[PDB]
């Protein structure tokens, strides 16, 4: 109940269209997301994909997608490389006072989630995230993607992202270990202040 409402507030995307995952991709459902959809996401019946770019070109959450490209005897090298790139992104984001959280996307990789108290301009957060990515070194076989990818999509639906807590895709701690009681974690997630994100954008933009 309160976990449902918190999940809605944290992962707030487009208020009119969402999507559901099937074997061939993500099918758009063109109606506002309701709570039974969240219950179907948690139960595992209808896995959700949220279009994070709202209608005014703002986002309330953003993400890094650290993904290992494919399947060897010693693949542990590449899983550890993904963990390394995630750790580097985490260090830079924490050095810039951006509260973020890790989630295991399955053996494909990891998600670094960034939450905001009120929607922030997609251009500013994309700019910040690509600069931070430009600061770090990547490892062999690892691709880093930045959501949102579109910044002024004033005519399309945009890009979507698979939200956690479905079928499991679970949040992990700083040591990349699965957190127990992910619901109280979901309630203990702290979102960044849009004022400080705007100040950080101005600082990085003028410098």
Tab-separated table of N, CA and C in Angstrom, residues 38-196:
chain	number	residue	atom	x	y	z
A	38	UNK	N	0.857	-1.768	-10.602
A	38	UNK	CA	2.013	-1.939	-9.727
A	38	UNK	C	1.953	-3.288	-9.023
A	39	UNK	N	0.751	-3.711	-8.620
A	39	UNK	CA	0.606	-5.022	-7.996
A	39	UNK	C	0.897	-6.144	-8.984
A	40	UNK	N	0.542	-5.956	-10.256
A	40	UNK	CA	0.887	-6.944	-11.271
A	40	UNK	C	2.381	-6.949	-11.551
A	41	UNK	N	3.031	-5.793	-11.428
A	41	UNK	CA	4.481	-5.737	-11.572
A	41	UNK	C	5.172	-6.497	-10.448
A	42	UNK	N	4.741	-6.268	-9.204
A	42	UNK	CA	5.376	-6.940	-8.072
A	42	UNK	C	5.104	-8.441	-8.087
A	43	UNK	N	3.872	-8.843	-8.410
A	43	UNK	CA	3.536	-10.263	-8.459
A	43	UNK	C	4.270	-10.978	-9.592
A	44	UNK	N	4.609	-10.261	-10.657
A	44	UNK	CA	5.270	-10.848	-11.801
A	44	UNK	C	4.377	-11.160	-12.980
A	45	UNK	N	3.126	-10.694	-12.971
A	45	UNK	CA	2.215	-10.969	-14.077
A	45	UNK	C	2.441	-9.999	-15.231
A	46	UNK	N	2.537	-8.703	-14.935
A	46	UNK	CA	2.739	-7.673	-15.954
A	46	UNK	C	3.950	-6.831	-15.554
A	47	UNK	N	5.118	-7.140	-16.117
A	47	UNK	CA	6.317	-6.364	-15.817
A	47	UNK	C	6.255	-5.003	-16.504
A	48	UNK	N	6.594	-3.953	-15.756
A	48	UNK	CA	6.402	-2.577	-16.190
A	48	UNK	C	7.653	-2.000	-16.833
A	49	UNK	N	7.442	-1.185	-17.863
A	49	UNK	CA	8.477	-0.342	-18.426
A	49	UNK	C	7.990	1.093	-18.475
A	50	UNK	N	8.671	1.997	-17.775
A	50	UNK	CA	8.195	3.365	-17.591
A	50	UNK	C	8.879	4.283	-18.593
A	51	UNK	N	8.084	5.121	-19.260
A	51	UNK	CA	8.591	6.200	-20.105
A	51	UNK	C	8.942	7.373	-19.197
A	52	UNK	N	10.239	7.574	-18.955
A	52	UNK	CA	10.677	8.513	-17.930
A	52	UNK	C	10.563	9.972	-18.354
A	53	UNK	N	10.512	10.256	-19.652
A	53	UNK	CA	10.450	11.636	-20.126
A	53	UNK	C	9.003	12.113	-20.089
A	54	UNK	N	8.709	13.059	-19.199
A	54	UNK	CA	7.363	13.595	-19.067
A	54	UNK	C	7.063	14.553	-20.219
A	55	UNK	N	5.841	15.092	-20.230
A	55	UNK	CA	5.383	15.872	-21.374
A	55	UNK	C	6.055	17.236	-21.465
A	56	UNK	N	6.552	17.775	-20.352
A	56	UNK	CA	7.247	19.056	-20.350
A	56	UNK	C	8.761	18.900	-20.435
A	57	UNK	N	9.240	17.777	-20.976
A	57	UNK	CA	10.672	17.517	-21.144
A	57	UNK	C	11.403	17.533	-19.802
A	58	UNK	N	10.751	17.005	-18.771
A	58	UNK	CA	11.352	16.856	-17.456
A	58	UNK	C	11.294	15.397	-17.024
A	59	UNK	N	12.133	15.057	-16.049
A	59	UNK	CA	12.196	13.711	-15.492
A	59	UNK	C	12.276	13.822	-13.976
A	60	UNK	N	11.635	12.884	-13.279
A	60	UNK	CA	11.775	12.789	-11.834
A	60	UNK	C	12.800	11.741	-11.419
A	61	UNK	N	13.219	10.878	-12.340
A	61	UNK	CA	14.293	9.934	-12.082
A	61	UNK	C	15.148	9.785	-13.333
A	62	UNK	N	16.392	9.361	-13.117
A	62	UNK	CA	17.351	9.122	-14.187
A	62	UNK	C	18.155	7.875	-13.844
A	63	UNK	N	18.934	7.385	-14.810
A	63	UNK	CA	19.609	6.118	-14.566
A	63	UNK	C	20.829	5.938	-15.458
A	64	UNK	N	21.793	5.203	-14.919
A	64	UNK	CA	22.910	4.639	-15.659
A	64	UNK	C	22.641	3.156	-15.872
A	65	UNK	N	22.900	2.677	-17.081
A	65	UNK	CA	22.740	1.266	-17.424
A	65	UNK	C	24.127	0.727	-17.748
A	66	UNK	N	24.729	0.029	-16.792
A	66	UNK	CA	26.024	-0.609	-16.990
A	66	UNK	C	25.755	-2.040	-17.441
A	67	UNK	N	26.094	-2.370	-18.685
A	67	UNK	CA	25.735	-3.676	-19.222
A	67	UNK	C	26.935	-4.341	-19.877
A	68	UNK	N	27.176	-5.591	-19.501
A	68	UNK	CA	28.221	-6.403	-20.112
A	68	UNK	C	27.682	-7.003	-21.406
A	69	UNK	N	28.442	-6.853	-22.488
A	69	UNK	CA	28.054	-7.424	-23.770
A	69	UNK	C	28.464	-8.890	-23.835
A	70	UNK	N	27.546	-9.733	-24.301
A	70	UNK	CA	27.756	-11.181	-24.321
A	70	UNK	C	28.932	-11.583	-25.208
A	71	UNK	N	29.278	-15.347	-21.177
A	71	UNK	CA	29.198	-16.423	-22.158
A	71	UNK	C	30.580	-16.992	-22.448
A	72	UNK	N	31.382	-17.140	-21.398
A	72	UNK	CA	32.708	-17.727	-21.502
A	72	UNK	C	32.962	-18.576	-20.265
A	73	UNK	N	34.053	-19.342	-20.302
A	73	UNK	CA	34.470	-20.090	-19.120
A	73	UNK	C	34.760	-19.147	-17.961
A	74	UNK	N	35.599	-18.142	-18.199
A	74	UNK	CA	35.913	-17.100	-17.225
A	74	UNK	C	35.257	-15.789	-17.657
A	75	UNK	N	33.972	-15.652	-17.338
A	75	UNK	CA	33.208	-14.431	-17.574
A	75	UNK	C	33.222	-13.532	-16.347
A	76	UNK	N	33.771	-14.050	-15.248
A	76	UNK	CA	33.847	-13.317	-13.996
A	76	UNK	C	34.653	-12.045	-14.180
A	77	UNK	N	35.616	-12.070	-15.104
A	77	UNK	CA	36.380	-10.871	-15.438
A	77	UNK	C	35.441	-9.756	-15.871
A	78	UNK	N	34.474	-10.088	-16.725
A	78	UNK	CA	33.580	-9.074	-17.263
A	78	UNK	C	32.509	-8.663	-16.259
A	79	UNK	N	32.041	-9.593	-15.419
A	79	UNK	CA	31.140	-9.176	-14.344
A	79	UNK	C	31.846	-8.221	-13.377
A	80	UNK	N	33.114	-8.502	-13.054
A	80	UNK	CA	33.871	-7.612	-12.182
A	80	UNK	C	34.167	-6.285	-12.867
A	81	UNK	N	34.327	-6.295	-14.192
A	81	UNK	CA	34.502	-5.047	-14.927
A	81	UNK	C	33.248	-4.185	-14.849
A	82	UNK	N	32.075	-4.812	-14.965
A	82	UNK	CA	30.825	-4.079	-14.789
A	82	UNK	C	30.746	-3.480	-13.389
A	83	UNK	N	31.100	-4.274	-12.372
A	83	UNK	CA	31.111	-3.751	-11.007
A	83	UNK	C	32.085	-2.584	-10.868
A	84	UNK	N	33.228	-2.654	-11.554
A	84	UNK	CA	34.211	-1.575	-11.490
A	84	UNK	C	33.658	-0.288	-12.084
A	85	UNK	N	33.063	-0.377	-13.275
A	85	UNK	CA	32.536	0.826	-13.916
A	85	UNK	C	31.402	1.417	-13.087
A	86	UNK	N	30.562	0.554	-12.505
A	86	UNK	CA	29.511	1.041	-11.618
A	86	UNK	C	30.100	1.745	-10.401
A	87	UNK	N	31.169	1.186	-9.827
A	87	UNK	CA	31.801	1.805	-8.666
A	87	UNK	C	32.395	3.165	-9.010
A	88	UNK	N	33.005	3.289	-10.189
A	88	UNK	CA	33.578	4.570	-10.602
A	88	UNK	C	32.492	5.627	-10.787
A	89	UNK	N	31.417	5.265	-11.495
A	89	UNK	CA	30.289	6.182	-11.628
A	89	UNK	C	29.739	6.571	-10.262
A	90	UNK	N	29.643	5.601	-9.349
A	90	UNK	CA	29.150	5.880	-8.006
A	90	UNK	C	30.055	6.857	-7.268
A	91	UNK	N	31.373	6.665	-7.360
A	91	UNK	CA	32.303	7.567	-6.686
A	91	UNK	C	32.146	8.992	-7.196
A	92	UNK	N	32.068	9.167	-8.519
A	92	UNK	CA	31.928	10.525	-9.046
A	92	UNK	C	30.592	11.147	-8.639
A	93	UNK	N	29.501	10.382	-8.765
A	93	UNK	CA	28.190	10.899	-8.388
A	93	UNK	C	28.150	11.284	-6.915
A	94	UNK	N	28.774	10.477	-6.054
A	94	UNK	CA	28.802	10.800	-4.636
A	94	UNK	C	29.687	12.005	-4.359
A	95	UNK	N	30.778	12.157	-5.110
A	95	UNK	CA	31.605	13.345	-4.969
A	95	UNK	C	30.857	14.602	-5.374
A	96	UNK	N	29.833	14.478	-6.218
A	96	UNK	CA	29.026	15.631	-6.598
A	96	UNK	C	27.690	15.695	-5.854
A	97	UNK	N	27.576	14.995	-4.720
A	97	UNK	CA	26.402	15.058	-3.841
A	97	UNK	C	25.118	14.656	-4.563
A	98	UNK	N	25.195	13.570	-5.322
A	98	UNK	CA	24.039	13.018	-6.014
A	98	UNK	C	23.740	11.666	-5.383
A	99	UNK	N	22.632	11.587	-4.652
A	99	UNK	CA	22.241	10.341	-4.004
A	99	UNK	C	21.709	9.362	-5.044
A	100	UNK	N	22.329	8.185	-5.121
A	100	UNK	CA	21.994	7.187	-6.127
A	100	UNK	C	21.953	5.818	-5.467
A	101	UNK	N	21.379	4.851	-6.179
A	101	UNK	CA	21.185	3.515	-5.628
A	101	UNK	C	21.371	2.453	-6.706
A	102	UNK	N	21.939	1.313	-6.315
A	102	UNK	CA	22.271	0.241	-7.244
A	102	UNK	C	21.150	-0.788	-7.329
A	103	UNK	N	20.975	-1.357	-8.522
A	103	UNK	CA	19.994	-2.417	-8.730
A	103	UNK	C	20.559	-3.415	-9.727
A	104	UNK	N	20.482	-4.698	-9.389
A	104	UNK	CA	20.918	-5.751	-10.299
A	104	UNK	C	19.853	-6.012	-11.361
A	105	UNK	N	20.218	-5.824	-12.627
A	105	UNK	CA	19.322	-6.029	-13.759
A	105	UNK	C	19.347	-7.469	-14.252
A	106	UNK	N	19.902	-8.380	-13.462
A	106	UNK	CA	20.241	-9.706	-13.928
A	106	UNK	C	21.649	-9.716	-14.481
A	107	UNK	N	22.063	-10.891	-14.960
A	107	UNK	CA	23.441	-11.068	-15.409
A	107	UNK	C	23.835	-10.120	-16.535
A	108	UNK	N	22.881	-9.395	-17.123
A	108	UNK	CA	23.226	-8.391	-18.124
A	108	UNK	C	23.998	-7.221	-17.523
A	109	UNK	N	23.691	-6.843	-16.283
A	109	UNK	CA	24.413	-5.742	-15.671
A	109	UNK	C	23.741	-5.112	-14.465
A	110	UNK	N	23.896	-3.794	-14.339
A	110	UNK	CA	23.436	-3.036	-13.187
A	110	UNK	C	22.804	-1.728	-13.645
A	111	UNK	N	21.971	-1.181	-12.765
A	111	UNK	CA	21.337	0.117	-12.930
A	111	UNK	C	21.743	0.994	-11.759
A	112	UNK	N	22.125	2.228	-12.060
A	112	UNK	CA	22.345	3.261	-11.056
A	112	UNK	C	21.176	4.228	-11.158
A	113	UNK	N	20.323	4.244	-10.137
A	113	UNK	CA	19.122	5.064	-10.113
A	113	UNK	C	19.392	6.367	-9.377
A	114	UNK	N	18.911	7.465	-9.957
A	114	UNK	CA	18.974	8.795	-9.368
A	114	UNK	C	17.549	9.311	-9.258
A	115	UNK	N	17.165	9.761	-8.068
A	115	UNK	CA	15.820	10.261	-7.837
A	115	UNK	C	15.860	11.732	-7.449
A	116	UNK	N	14.784	12.441	-7.785
A	116	UNK	CA	14.657	13.865	-7.515
A	116	UNK	C	13.346	14.133	-6.789
A	117	UNK	N	13.338	15.203	-5.991
A	117	UNK	CA	12.130	15.563	-5.256
A	117	UNK	C	11.054	16.108	-6.189
A	118	UNK	N	11.428	16.983	-7.117
A	118	UNK	CA	10.514	17.444	-8.160
A	118	UNK	C	11.196	17.255	-9.508
A	119	UNK	N	10.416	17.136	-10.587
A	119	UNK	CA	11.016	16.926	-11.912
A	119	UNK	C	12.027	18.006	-12.270
A	120	UNK	N	13.152	17.570	-12.831
A	120	UNK	CA	14.212	18.460	-13.284
A	120	UNK	C	14.313	18.365	-14.800
A	121	UNK	N	14.881	19.408	-15.403
A	121	UNK	CA	15.034	19.438	-16.851
A	121	UNK	C	15.894	18.271	-17.322
A	122	UNK	N	15.427	17.583	-18.367
A	122	UNK	CA	16.134	16.403	-18.858
A	122	UNK	C	17.486	16.778	-19.449
A	123	UNK	N	17.563	17.942	-20.095
A	123	UNK	CA	18.825	18.398	-20.665
A	123	UNK	C	19.893	18.556	-19.592
A	124	UNK	N	19.540	19.174	-18.462
A	124	UNK	CA	20.536	19.416	-17.421
A	124	UNK	C	21.078	18.113	-16.846
A	125	UNK	N	20.189	17.172	-16.520
A	125	UNK	CA	20.640	15.933	-15.897
A	125	UNK	C	21.399	15.071	-16.900
A	126	UNK	N	20.976	15.078	-18.168
A	126	UNK	CA	21.729	14.358	-19.190
A	126	UNK	C	23.126	14.943	-19.353
A	127	UNK	N	23.233	16.275	-19.356
A	127	UNK	CA	24.530	16.940	-19.446
A	127	UNK	C	25.437	16.527	-18.293
A	128	UNK	N	24.916	16.609	-17.065
A	128	UNK	CA	25.686	16.220	-15.884
A	128	UNK	C	26.169	14.779	-16.009
A	129	UNK	N	25.266	13.874	-16.398
A	129	UNK	CA	25.614	12.459	-16.416
A	129	UNK	C	26.632	12.139	-17.505
A	130	UNK	N	26.521	12.770	-18.679
A	130	UNK	CA	27.512	12.491	-19.715
A	130	UNK	C	28.874	13.087	-19.370
A	131	UNK	N	28.921	14.241	-18.695
A	131	UNK	CA	30.216	14.730	-18.221
A	131	UNK	C	30.839	13.756	-17.223
A	132	UNK	N	30.034	13.276	-16.269
A	132	UNK	CA	30.544	12.324	-15.285
A	132	UNK	C	31.038	11.056	-15.974
A	133	UNK	N	30.320	10.600	-17.004
A	133	UNK	CA	30.774	9.435	-17.760
A	133	UNK	C	32.076	9.722	-18.494
A	134	UNK	N	32.215	10.932	-19.036
A	134	UNK	CA	33.443	11.316	-19.715
A	134	UNK	C	34.630	11.382	-18.767
A	135	UNK	N	34.390	11.520	-17.461
A	135	UNK	CA	35.522	11.568	-16.538
A	135	UNK	C	36.144	10.199	-16.273
A	136	UNK	N	35.364	9.124	-16.324
A	136	UNK	CA	35.822	7.813	-15.880
A	136	UNK	C	36.324	7.012	-17.072
A	137	UNK	N	37.089	5.962	-16.783
A	137	UNK	CA	37.518	5.012	-17.799
A	137	UNK	C	36.616	3.787	-17.768
A	138	UNK	N	36.259	3.297	-18.948
A	138	UNK	CA	35.430	2.109	-19.055
A	138	UNK	C	36.323	0.875	-19.153
A	139	UNK	N	35.709	-0.295	-19.040
A	139	UNK	CA	36.438	-1.550	-19.124
A	139	UNK	C	35.959	-2.349	-20.330
A	140	UNK	N	36.730	-3.380	-20.669
A	140	UNK	CA	36.464	-4.165	-21.868
A	140	UNK	C	35.146	-4.919	-21.733
A	141	UNK	N	34.289	-4.788	-22.744
A	141	UNK	CA	33.031	-5.502	-22.783
A	141	UNK	C	31.880	-4.837	-22.060
A	142	UNK	N	32.072	-3.630	-21.534
A	142	UNK	CA	31.057	-2.930	-20.755
A	142	UNK	C	30.582	-1.713	-21.537
A	143	UNK	N	29.264	-1.559	-21.642
A	143	UNK	CA	28.631	-0.411	-22.276
A	143	UNK	C	27.795	0.322	-21.238
A	144	UNK	N	27.946	1.640	-21.181
A	144	UNK	CA	27.195	2.473	-20.252
A	144	UNK	C	26.204	3.297	-21.059
A	145	UNK	N	24.929	3.194	-20.698
A	145	UNK	CA	23.865	3.959	-21.328
A	145	UNK	C	23.290	4.934	-20.309
A	146	UNK	N	22.777	6.061	-20.793
A	146	UNK	CA	22.251	7.113	-19.928
A	146	UNK	C	20.778	7.326	-20.246
A	147	UNK	N	19.918	7.138	-19.236
A	147	UNK	CA	18.509	7.501	-19.319
A	147	UNK	C	18.283	8.777	-18.528
A	148	UNK	N	17.673	9.821	-19.112
A	148	UNK	CA	17.030	9.851	-20.431
A	148	UNK	C	17.983	10.042	-21.606
A	149	UNK	N	17.678	9.391	-22.727
A	149	UNK	CA	18.451	9.588	-23.946
A	149	UNK	C	17.940	10.762	-24.770
A	150	UNK	N	16.628	10.963	-24.812
A	150	UNK	CA	16.050	12.097	-25.512
A	150	UNK	C	15.860	13.244	-24.527
A	151	UNK	N	16.157	14.466	-24.973
A	151	UNK	CA	16.099	15.626	-24.091
A	151	UNK	C	14.955	16.589	-24.377
A	152	UNK	N	14.539	16.740	-25.635
A	152	UNK	CA	13.434	17.629	-25.992
A	152	UNK	C	12.483	16.909	-26.949
A	153	UNK	N	11.995	15.745	-26.521
A	153	UNK	CA	11.103	14.928	-27.343
A	153	UNK	C	9.663	15.430	-27.228
A	154	UNK	N	9.462	16.668	-27.677
A	154	UNK	CA	8.136	17.273	-27.677
A	154	UNK	C	7.323	16.834	-28.888
A	155	UNK	N	7.188	15.521	-29.084
A	155	UNK	CA	6.318	15.004	-30.123
A	155	UNK	C	6.274	13.489	-30.179
A	156	UNK	N	7.154	12.833	-29.418
A	156	UNK	CA	7.218	11.394	-29.364
A	156	UNK	C	6.930	10.874	-27.963
A	157	UNK	N	7.031	9.549	-27.829
A	157	UNK	CA	6.823	8.932	-26.524
A	157	UNK	C	8.100	8.940	-25.696
A	158	UNK	N	9.249	8.829	-26.347
A	158	UNK	CA	10.522	8.783	-25.666
A	158	UNK	C	11.010	7.367	-25.448
A	159	UNK	N	11.956	7.248	-24.526
A	159	UNK	CA	12.528	5.965	-24.151
A	159	UNK	C	11.946	5.490	-22.829
A	160	UNK	N	11.964	4.175	-22.643
A	160	UNK	CA	11.436	3.539	-21.452
A	160	UNK	C	12.544	2.758	-20.760
A	161	UNK	N	12.318	2.464	-19.485
A	161	UNK	CA	13.271	1.717	-18.673
A	161	UNK	C	12.503	0.744	-17.790
A	162	UNK	N	13.066	-0.451	-17.620
A	162	UNK	CA	12.475	-1.451	-16.744
A	162	UNK	C	12.717	-1.074	-15.288
A	163	UNK	N	11.642	-0.989	-14.512
A	163	UNK	CA	11.735	-0.570	-13.115
A	163	UNK	C	12.046	-1.779	-12.240
A	164	UNK	N	12.646	-1.583	-11.061
A	164	UNK	CA	13.039	-2.728	-10.227
A	164	UNK	C	11.867	-3.436	-9.568
A	165	UNK	N	12.178	-4.432	-8.734
A	165	UNK	CA	11.181	-5.175	-7.962
A	165	UNK	C	10.215	-5.953	-8.855
A	166	UNK	N	10.697	-6.434	-9.997
A	166	UNK	CA	9.893	-7.307	-10.830
A	166	UNK	C	10.607	-8.612	-11.119
A	167	UNK	N	10.024	-9.449	-11.969
A	167	UNK	CA	10.649	-10.718	-12.317
A	167	UNK	C	11.006	-10.751	-13.801
A	168	UNK	N	14.959	-12.208	-9.664
A	168	UNK	CA	14.289	-10.927	-9.473
A	168	UNK	C	15.278	-9.765	-9.577
A	169	UNK	N	14.794	-8.625	-10.068
A	169	UNK	CA	15.597	-7.409	-10.204
A	169	UNK	C	15.501	-6.624	-8.902
A	170	UNK	N	16.562	-6.673	-8.100
A	170	UNK	CA	16.528	-6.171	-6.735
A	170	UNK	C	17.645	-5.166	-6.503
A	171	UNK	N	17.408	-4.272	-5.546
A	171	UNK	CA	18.401	-3.276	-5.168
A	171	UNK	C	19.530	-3.925	-4.378
A	172	UNK	N	20.750	-3.423	-4.576
A	172	UNK	CA	21.916	-3.918	-3.856
A	172	UNK	C	22.621	-2.748	-3.181
A	173	UNK	N	23.499	-3.082	-2.238
A	173	UNK	CA	24.178	-2.087	-1.417
A	173	UNK	C	25.504	-1.687	-2.069
A	174	UNK	N	26.397	-1.059	-1.297
A	174	UNK	CA	27.670	-0.598	-1.845
A	174	UNK	C	28.601	-1.750	-2.201
A	175	UNK	N	28.450	-2.900	-1.550
A	175	UNK	CA	29.237	-4.080	-1.877
A	175	UNK	C	28.553	-4.972	-2.904
A	176	UNK	N	27.509	-4.469	-3.567
A	176	UNK	CA	26.763	-5.219	-4.580
A	176	UNK	C	26.180	-6.504	-3.999
A	177	UNK	N	25.665	-6.416	-2.778
A	177	UNK	CA	24.997	-7.532	-2.127
A	177	UNK	C	23.510	-7.234	-2.023
A	178	UNK	N	22.694	-8.275	-2.194
A	178	UNK	CA	21.249	-8.093	-2.207
A	178	UNK	C	20.779	-7.603	-0.847
A	179	UNK	N	19.989	-6.534	-0.854
A	179	UNK	CA	19.422	-5.992	0.374
A	179	UNK	C	18.226	-6.832	0.796
A	180	UNK	N	18.162	-7.152	2.086
A	180	UNK	CA	16.976	-7.775	2.649
A	180	UNK	C	15.962	-6.699	3.011
A	181	UNK	N	14.680	-7.058	2.930
A	181	UNK	CA	13.576	-6.127	3.162
A	181	UNK	C	13.696	-4.902	2.249
A	182	UNK	N	13.506	-5.165	0.955
A	182	UNK	CA	13.615	-4.111	-0.044
A	182	UNK	C	12.479	-3.099	0.037
A	183	UNK	N	11.431	-3.374	0.814
A	183	UNK	CA	10.324	-2.429	0.931
A	183	UNK	C	10.688	-1.282	1.867
A	184	UNK	N	11.306	-1.593	3.008
A	184	UNK	CA	11.777	-0.527	3.885
A	184	UNK	C	12.955	0.215	3.267
A	185	UNK	N	13.757	-0.464	2.443
A	185	UNK	CA	14.735	0.244	1.621
A	185	UNK	C	14.056	1.219	0.671
A	186	UNK	N	13.026	0.752	-0.038
A	186	UNK	CA	12.274	1.624	-0.933
A	186	UNK	C	11.745	2.840	-0.182
A	187	UNK	N	11.338	2.646	1.074
A	187	UNK	CA	10.875	3.758	1.897
A	187	UNK	C	12.019	4.606	2.442
A	188	UNK	N	13.243	4.078	2.479
A	188	UNK	CA	14.400	4.822	2.962
A	188	UNK	C	15.225	5.426	1.834
A	189	UNK	N	14.749	5.341	0.595
A	189	UNK	CA	15.426	5.997	-0.514
A	189	UNK	C	15.252	7.505	-0.377
A	190	UNK	N	16.350	8.246	-0.491
A	190	UNK	CA	16.325	9.701	-0.423
A	190	UNK	C	16.591	10.264	-1.813
A	191	UNK	N	15.751	11.204	-2.232
A	191	UNK	CA	15.823	11.827	-3.545
A	191	UNK	C	16.606	13.130	-3.456
A	192	UNK	N	17.230	13.509	-4.568
A	192	UNK	CA	18.012	14.735	-4.604
A	192	UNK	C	17.106	15.959	-4.704
A	193	UNK	N	17.628	17.092	-4.240
A	193	UNK	CA	16.900	18.353	-4.271
A	193	UNK	C	17.125	19.023	-5.621
A	194	UNK	N	16.028	19.400	-6.284
A	194	UNK	CA	16.133	19.990	-7.616
A	194	UNK	C	16.916	21.295	-7.604
A	195	UNK	N	16.853	22.046	-6.502
A	195	UNK	CA	17.616	23.286	-6.409
A	195	UNK	C	19.113	23.015	-6.495
A	196	UNK	N	19.585	21.985	-5.792
A	196	UNK	CA	21.008	21.678	-5.818
A	196	UNK	C	21.425	21.077	-7.153
